[PDB]
Design a protein around this ligand. Structure first.
Ligand SMILES: *[C@@H]1O[C@H](CO)[C@@H](O)[C@H](O)[C@H]1NC(C)=O
Ligand SMILES: *[C@@H]1O[C@H](CO)[C@@H](O)[C@H](O)[C@H]1NC(C)=O
Ligand SMILES: *[C@@H]1O[C@H](CO)[C@@H](O)[C@H](O)[C@H]1NC(C)=O
Lengths: 78, 98
């Protein structure tokens, strides 16, 4: 059996947060995770790095800001 | 040796704790443990907000279950009986031969 498999490579480290605090609401990524390149926050898929602007389409609110541990302040675009 | 098998076990545990399942499919990729368990809830069909809102409770439940595992093993040695069975069988065979 010749198994063709996908192997990740060229890893890069980022600062990550569980949720984004916008106007009193927590925001969680619908798919992917929240990363930071030092000054700006993006949402990317887990296995590949394609940063995108955190918007309402790729985030769901589902809660408040105080309960979540590690939440950070950032704007969610509409 | 037993020490080498212990070191394999420790390496597997460290990789699982620090990198999730990434180290098994390639280079070990660092990730906070809560985010790893958020992925793991997302796999079983539960949204990650459930973990993040209930992080302390889930941590306490996991700690209690892990602590209870040792008492469960200690109370009933028969849980290891299968392993003991292996050893016993081998010994019996040799004794029969003698
Ligand atoms: C990534 O790794 C480098 C190592 O050179 C370190 O200096 C940095 O603090 C790490 N984190 C980020 C977000 O760059
Ligand atoms: C992070 O990315 C933004 C692009 O939105 C860029 O303007 C900024 O310079 C980057 N910061 C670093 C430290 O690379
Ligand atoms: C930034 O986050 C902190 C959480 O420690 C919160 O108290 C603060 O209100 C946030 N910023 C704004 C402008 O709301």
């Amino acid at each position: 059996f010749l198994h063709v498999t996908y192997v990740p490579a060229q890893e890069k480290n980022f600062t990550t947060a569980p949720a984004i605090c916008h106007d009193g609401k927590a925001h969680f990524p619908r798919e992917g995770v929240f990363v930071s390149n030092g000054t700006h926050w993006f949402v990317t898929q887990r296995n590949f790095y394609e940063p995108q602007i955190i918007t309402t389409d790729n985030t769901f609110v589902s809660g408040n800001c105080d309960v979540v541990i590690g939440i950070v302040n950032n704007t969610v675009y509409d | 040796t037993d020490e080498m098998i212990a070191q394999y076990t420790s390496a597997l545990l460290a990789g699982t704790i620090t990198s999730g399942w990434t180290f098994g499919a390639g280079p070990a990729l660092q990730i906070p443990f809560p985010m790893q368990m958020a992925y793991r809830f997302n796999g079983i069909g539960v949204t990650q907000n459930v973990l993040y809102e209930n992080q302390k409770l889930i941590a306490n439940q996991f700690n209690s279950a892990i602590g209870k595992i040792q008492d469960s093993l200690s109370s009933t040695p028969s849980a290891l009986g299968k392993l003991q069975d292996v050893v016993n069988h081998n010994a019996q065979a040799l004794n029969t031969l003698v």
